[PDB]
């Protein structure tokens, strides 16, 4: 029994500190991401592999939402996904969404 | 709906080609010194990467300078350098620029496997490697001179080329001669030509490059792309808040590289420009250019030049690529997704007192999962001041808030995910109980389907938070809400073993029980009857129990009705919801019928009345598992001494086999079996011996002598419910365990007689030892490769979703029961049931329609099936559905995690995925009739000879049991000259062979009586005098096509059927002549001037199953020795002996000449090239090729043959996974077509299908007559489908990123976010389900109006 | 409570777009931008709004009639 949702993650990645030693939070595998994908389970699974401890800001961004209590989020972007873009952006294509 | 006046979401994503003067679109300002050091003091020189003039305020309206330190001023600029005060936060999103002074290329579009830029402008790879390392010249604009365009022309030979051509002559290198040479490119010109010569060129090394470059150029028409947009003029400058730059304790910096690049980036690109200002020579400021390029690739990794590392140290710089990307996609949708948030991480305990729709929580968890909501609770009531002073009363517990703690938990869903999770079936919500421990409860009657245990299985919780979470648990994911399997529609939760007692001990009849006979008004007092206990609970006593039926359309009807009922079923009634018959209650409980009895309740009842009347059983489940006390001690069980009398029987016989041996009658072998058959035949006699022993030799005094009731044995009982009573295991317990495995994989002759409850020796261990080895290995690893299948099912079916209800086809396939070998085993019915109708449906009886065409079969309609004998009936399947792109609910169902219609948003394709993945870990003569039925000859042209043998003279001997109704029950395939006893219409019992014949002889008959003359076939030239040792009687033994002669390879042994005059007897139907030709290796059972009857001998001819086979199943292997089908209906013939091969000149009599086919003889060839045969006659015998059946007789055979074959595989496996699930999982292999006609596309390109089936939709309809291009369904294995991946975001994942990303780079391929992995990578909802009518509004407002 | 929700699909039947339009009822029934009709008893505002659908007095209809109305609140 390691409880953890809450508290610090390292720093070299976004990976929490710790495992099955100091905050055991759940190491999320690629097949129960699957199971989420079985299931209706879409805007749950967003939050999931982002707004909930994949976004270094997005997860505060949550915080400082729930003391409020308003769950409400607009579609808000992985960010590294914004850097994606700035990939494509340094070679041929481009973004520029129109309209 | 009506688009919005107001910006709600971000539309569908588009993803093409720019313009750099779109870049210029981000100029904030211009990135010049990397340096951010006063050159000595560390002083944060902005004017560079980290500046507020080329980018924004240090901080939130916060100047450079200091100027403005006011979180007010927005807009106004630090008039020394033009500061815009906004929010520097916005800093992650600032972009900026560099006015390059040079024309750059991209040698990552040049050393990509694919040579972009070579099949860009149609030259040699190789002569543009030496134009973009500057080491030669390329003509440009010049063309018609000494070169030609798409030439070079070296240092010397330029210098030649000037020589002869000063005149209207220009060639310079590199990315600005190459500009010249893309401001130039005529598109359009070279189509035209391009197709001309698709016309005109006919090599392979020709057209093959021909439709390579003509597709390419027209995908640049696809997106109005002009090659100029490649040459980069400008350099795009990333957000400051991408790469960091800290100070280091000490006077040192620990920086990450992304600066060390950029700055090199800059560093050689002002120099470049300060060396053109010097206008230095040539080779040198493009030997600069090369150093521009490479610090492009300094970015990506290095591109592919040589790992740049640093001054004296080795490291690779900095690689964005993998930084964005890396591993199983990128470091989140892979196996890397952190530890959760709103998550809890522990081993769970059980908990009987929790009712159906709630789990229980720890405390502990509980504080830790729901402080936000207490601290905006805290301060919403009142009861705490700020949130820090909410800290505080937590820091110490305060009882007050627990109780706001409770106001958070009394009704809030909660999300319950084990971890060795692999199937959706472990995933559920529930509601909250508090509970004072340290592991997480769960409902006793949902941990089966999980499949999770008590041994240290860990369920992580996930609060929903969101109200969308919250309703999709208490939506679909509710444990109200996944009662039956989304595999076949019965409710998955089927009582275990400890329940299934309780209720097994209390519905139970016997003949000696306190009170029986007595009557009671209610089955009321009949509970306070035997709480009390003044009688015993299998006493037969009349209760007037009031069973209900639903005699109406919703009123049921009351009946009320007097059972002389033992006291436990009666007591089982109080808990049975009214409309289910007491009927179903009124047996000695059957785990078969407690399953399916919640099923009739859900059929009868509905959804309510089964959930609740299911939590009601758990609760009594235990309560009269209570009672039952069911112990077994040693000195409860029963051992029969007729055990160790039916070893003295089965030592007897084996003592004297093995001397038979020291005589030497029987073989090794012969006695090996032998020995096996008698010990297992002794096994039964042990098993009906502790069988009927233990089942009903209890006899007590009851108004009679000694009335004997079923034995009340503990073991019994569990052999009867259902439970967990295996009498297999149970008898290997209790009589002989039997003969084990050995090492080898075979069997050790040697039993373990000495039973489990009695002694066993270290001899009988190690038989069974093998044993205990095999079972472990097989799983550990079957584990692992049920994996990487249910990797490979997502694999294919990702993009399938259900998104119309109906749309145009009266099509599907033909269902039909799979009566093979005896016993019909899968009905019509529960293949159809739960699916749509296609066509109006006649009954057996003619022009009688029961089922119109759309309706909707459910078990009523599927017993209105069963009223008539219908047997044949078509359903719209999804391969022949034509919804484009997705599938309609009228060509899919209803049968899934519930019973109703199948709604738009559900995304199938890996709902299917999962379904049938689930069972990888449980993957691995003379016969006479059994069947009493009618023998039906269909289609077989058998004949009456001597002895009244009814011998069969055809190949399709297809036998049927048409029964006393008409539905054929057995089938069987008789081989080739093979006695039948009965005809067709001649009723036969069961026990009787008329499928009677000879493995050993497959025997050449004749179809009428005739003389037999043998022609060629002389003793030396074709055939041997092979008349044996045994039989003198005569006969000419056919020597093969190898043994007869030299020139005796092309004379044909030919057996003339003449008459007494010396006429031919023609053929039945035909003019052609009677010329059997006796094959290779025959005993000719006949000479010259022997009739042959109607049927008589006239030559003699002797002669995995689980995840491998079904693995090669998707990569649908082409076999060892390959079965070919007859190509075409007509005759067969032969040609040119073996070379190596042989011509199997298959010429239509009804078809197109030319057709022939080479096969090498080495197999067994069942050709009858005296018939005319029909396409689709095996040729030759072995394994099958999915393939050919698919392109020959149609997508429709092949499909239901091999959903049929593996029908057949997961039978044997005791699973039903259901077959549309497997019907979608085909539709994408064969996803992508290759074209076979001419027409708007191209003669042989593998596209689309869907796409193609609406290019025919519209090419019968306008802007055409008939010029479509008709296909042919080309298969992919899932290698190829997955690496056939439209979505490049996700073939790039897990394959060559540079490969795929400049697969769809060439022309910038919009990925309109259209699918489900794009969702992933973006983070949205798919365009089904939730987010179903969500994305609606979203291409509501997208590409369109 | 709650024993099953085969009421909410006799009602609206989606079994997905259920979830998104009633939560975002309960959104509004949050931010103090409205308030609920239904009494709740003691359900938080995601069992409430599974009480409004399956009576029926509450949908999709009559949502997006809030909606409209709320623009001639605001507008004038």
Redesign the interface.
């Known amino acids: 029994m390691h409880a953890r949702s809450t508290g610090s993650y390292s720093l070299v990645t976004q990976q929490p500190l710790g495992g099955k030693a100091q905050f055991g939070g759940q190491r999320f595998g690629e097949m129960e991401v699957w199971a989420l994908e079985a299931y ?1 389970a879409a805007y749950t699974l967003q939050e999931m592999l982002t707004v909930k401890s994949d976004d270094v800001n997005g997860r505060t961004k949550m915080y400082k939402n729930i003391v409020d ?4 989020m607009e579609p808000g972007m992985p960010e590294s996904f914004n850097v994606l873009l700035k990939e494509i952006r340094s070679l041929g294509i481009n973004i520029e969404l129109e309209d | 709906l009506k688009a919005q006046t107001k910006t709600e979401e971000f539309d569908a994503i588009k993803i093409a080609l720019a313009s750099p003067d779109m870049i210029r679109s981000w100029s904030f300002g211009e990135v010049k010194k990397p340096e951010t050091i006063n050159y000595r003091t560390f002083k944060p020189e902005r004017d560079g990467l980290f500046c507020a003039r080329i980018f924004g305020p240090v901080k939130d309206y916060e100047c450079l300078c200091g100027k403005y330190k006011r979180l007010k001023h927005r807009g106004v600029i630090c008039e020394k350098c033009g500061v815009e005060v906004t929010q520097t936060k916005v800093r992650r999103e600032r972009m900026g620029h560099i006015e390059l002074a040079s024309p750059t290329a991209h040698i990552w579009f040049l050393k990509s496997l694919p040579s972009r830029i070579g099949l860009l402008l149609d030259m040699p790879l190789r002569d543009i490697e030496r134009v973009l390392y500057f080491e030669s010249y390329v003509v440009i604009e010049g063309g018609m001179t000494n070169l030609e365009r798409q030439q070079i022309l070296t240092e010397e030979q330029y210098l030649d080329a000037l020589e002869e051509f000063g005149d209207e002559f220009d060639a310079k290198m590199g990315a600005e001669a190459i500009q010249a040479l893309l401001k130039s490119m005529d598109l359009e010109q070279e189509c035209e030509q391009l197709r001309e010569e698709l016309n005109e060129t006919n090599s392979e090394t020709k057209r093959k490059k021909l439709t390579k470059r003509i597709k390419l150029l027209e995908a640049f028409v696809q997106s109005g792309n002009k090659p100029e947009w490649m040459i980069l003029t400008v350099l795009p400058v990333l957000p400051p808040d991408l790469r960091p730059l800290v100070p280091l304790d000490g006077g040192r910096f620990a920086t990450s590289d992304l600066n060390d690049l950029y700055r090199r980036v800059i560093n050689r690109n002002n120099r470049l420009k300060r060396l053109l200002d010097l206008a230095a020579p040539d080779i040198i400021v493009r030997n600069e250019k090369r150093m521009l390029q490479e610090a492009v690739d300094a970015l990506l990794d290095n591109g592919r030049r040589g790992r740049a590392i640093t001054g004296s140290n080795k490291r690779p710089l900095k690689s964005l690529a993998d930084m964005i990307k890396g591993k199983q996609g990128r470091f989140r949708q892979n196996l890397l997704g952190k530890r959760v948030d709103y998550s809890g991480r522990s081993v769970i305990t059980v908990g009987p007192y929790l ?4 789990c229980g929580l720890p405390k502990k968890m509980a504080l830790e999962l729901f402080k936000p909501f207490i601290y905006g609770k805290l301060e919403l009531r009142g009861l705490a001041t700020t949130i820090k002073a909410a800290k505080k009363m937590v820091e110490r517990e305060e009882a007050v808030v627990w109780d706001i703690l409770d106001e ?1 938990i ?4 909660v999300l319950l995910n084990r971890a060795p999770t692999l199937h959706r079936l472990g995933i559920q919500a529930f ?1 909250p109980v508090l509970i004072e421990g340290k592991a997480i409860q769960l409902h006793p009657l949902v941990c089966a389907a999980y499949n999770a245990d008590f041994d240290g299985d860990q369920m992580a919780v996930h609060v929903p938070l ?3 979470a ?7 994911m ?1 444990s ?2 996944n009662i039956l399997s989304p595999a076949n529609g019965e409710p998955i939760i089927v009582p275990s073993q400890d329940v299934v007692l309780g209720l097994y001990y209390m519905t139970r009849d016997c003949v000696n029980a306190k009170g029986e006979g007595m009557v009671l008004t209610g089955p009321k007092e009949a509970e306070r009857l035997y709480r009390s206990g003044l009688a015993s609970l299998h006493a037969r006593v009349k209760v007037r129990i009031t069973e209900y039926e639903k005699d109406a359309n919703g009123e049921l009807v009351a009946k009320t009705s007097l059972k002389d009922t033992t006291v436990g079923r009666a007591i089982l009634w109080m808990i049975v919801p009214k409309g289910l018959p007491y009927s179903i209650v009124n047996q000695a409980l059957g785990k078969k019928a407690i399953s399916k009895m919640l099923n009739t309740c859900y059929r009868i009842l ?3 009345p089964t ?2 009347f299911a939590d009601q059983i758990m609760y009594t489940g235990f309560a009269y598992a209570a009672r039952s006390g069911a112990s077994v001690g040693i000195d409860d069980m029963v051992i029969p001494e007729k055990k160790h009398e039916i070893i003295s029987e089965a030592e007897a016989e084996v003592a004297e086999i093995q001397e038979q041996f020291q005589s030497g009658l029987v073989t090794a072998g012969e006695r090996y079996n032998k020995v096996i058959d008698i010990w297992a035949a002794a096994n039964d006699r042990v098993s009906k011996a502790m069988m009927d022993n233990l089942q009903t030799e209890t006899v007590i005094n009851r108004d009679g002598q000694e009335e004997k009731q079923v034995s009340f044995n503990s073991i019994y009982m569990m052999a009867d419910s259902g439970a967990r009573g295996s009498a297999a295991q149970i008898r290997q317990l209790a009589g002989m365990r039997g003969l084990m495995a050995k090492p080898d994989g075979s069997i050790i002759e040697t039993p373990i007689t000495a039973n489990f409850r009695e002694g066993l020796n270290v001899l009988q261990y190690f038989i069974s030892t093998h044993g205990a080895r095999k079972g472990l290995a097989d799983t550990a690893l079957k584990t692992a490769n049920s994996g990487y299948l249910t990797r490979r099912l997502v694999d294919v079916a990702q993009d399938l979703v259900v998104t119309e209800d109906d749309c145009g086809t009266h099509e599907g396939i033909m269902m039909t029961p799979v009566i093979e070998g005896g016993d019909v085993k899968e009905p019509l019915r529960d293949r159809v049931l739960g699916r749509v109708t296609a066509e109006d449906v006649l009954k057996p009886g003619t022009a009688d329609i029961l089922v119109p065409r759309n309706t909707l079969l459910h078990e009523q309609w599927c017993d209105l099936l069963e009223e008539n004998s219908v047997d044949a009936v078509k359903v719209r399947s999804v391969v022949s559905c034509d919804t484009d792109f997705g599938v309609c609910a009228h060509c899919y169902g209803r049968d899934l995690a ?1 019973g ?1 219609i199948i ?1 738009k ?1 559900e995304a199938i394709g890996v709902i299917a995925a999962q379904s049938i993945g689930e069972p990888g870990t449980q993957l691995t003569s003379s016969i006479q009739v059994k069947n009493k039925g009618s023998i039906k000859l269909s289609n077989v042209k058998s004949v009456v000879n001597s002895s009244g043998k009814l011998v069969i003279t055809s190949r399709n001997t297809e036998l049927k049991l048409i029964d006393e109704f008409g539905r054929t029950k057995e089938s069987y395939k008789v081989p080739y000259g093979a006695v039948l006893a009965k005809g067709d219409g001649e009723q036969v019992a069961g026990g009787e062979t008329v499928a009677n014949w000879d493995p050993h002889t497959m025997p050449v008959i004749t179809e009428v009586s005739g003389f037999v003359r043998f022609t060629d076939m002389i003793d030396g030239q074709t055939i041997t005098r092979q008349t044996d040792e045994l039989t003198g009687l005569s006969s000419l033994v056919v020597l093969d096509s190898a043994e007869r002669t030299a020139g005796g390879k092309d004379l044909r042994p030919a057996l003339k059927i003449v008459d007494a005059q010396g006429n031919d007897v023609l053929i039945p139907g035909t003019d052609m002549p009677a010329q059997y030709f006796l094959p290779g290796k025959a005993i000719v059972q006949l000479e010259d001037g022997v009739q042959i009857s109607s049927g008589d001998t006239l030559a003699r001819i002797p002669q995995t199953g689980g995840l491998p086979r079904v693995a090669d199943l998707f990569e649908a292997r082409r076999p060892k020795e390959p079965a070919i089908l007859a190509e075409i209906s007509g005759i067969v013939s032969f040609g040119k002996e073996t070379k190596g091969k042989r011509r199997l000149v298959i010429t239509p009599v009804d078809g197109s000449d030319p057709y022939e086919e080479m096969i090498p003889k080495w197999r067994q060839l069942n050709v009858f090239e005296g018939e005319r045969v029909e396409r689709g006659d095996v040729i030759s015998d072995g394994p099958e090729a999915p393939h050919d059946i698919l392109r020959l007789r149609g997508v429709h055979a092949v499909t239901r043959y091999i959903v049929n074959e593996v029908q057949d595989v997961y039978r044997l496996q005791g699973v039903k996974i259901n077959d549309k699930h497997i019907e979608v999982i085909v539709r994408q292999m064969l996803r992508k077509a290759t074209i076979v006609n001419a027409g708007s596309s191209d003669f042989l390109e593998g596209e689309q299908v869907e796409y193609s089936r609406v290019k025919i939709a519209n090419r019968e309809l306008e802007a055409n007559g008939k010029v479509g291009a008709t296909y042919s369904r080309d298969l992919l294995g899932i290698t190829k489908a997955s690496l056939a991946t439209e979505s490049f975001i996700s073939a790039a994942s897990f394959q060559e990123t540079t490969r795929v990303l400049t697969e769809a780079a060439v022309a910038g391929k919009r990925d309109e976010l259209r699918g489900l992995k794009e969702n992933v990578i973006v983070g949205r909802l798919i365009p089904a ?2 987010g ?3 994305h609606q509004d979203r291409m509501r407002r997208r590409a369109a109006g | ?6 009421d909410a ?1 006799e009602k609206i ?8 339009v ?2 975002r009822r ?2 509004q029934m ?2 103090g931008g409205k308030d609920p009709l239904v009494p709740e008893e ?6 409430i ?2 009480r409004e659908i399956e009576e029926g007095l509450i949908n999709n209809q009559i949502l997006d009639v809030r909606e409209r109305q709320e623009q001639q609140e605001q507008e004038a």
């Open positions: 209706g209590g308003n769950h409400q | 009712r159906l729709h709630q958070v009394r009704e809030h869903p509601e969101t109200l969308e919250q309703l999709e648990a208490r939506a679909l509710m109200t809400n509905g959804l309510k959930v609740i519930r109703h709604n948003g389900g939730t179903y009518a969500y | 409570a709650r024993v099953t929700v085969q699909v039947g989606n079994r997905f777009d259920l979830v998104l009633a939560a309960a959104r949050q931010v003691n359900d938080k505002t995601t069992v709004a599974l």
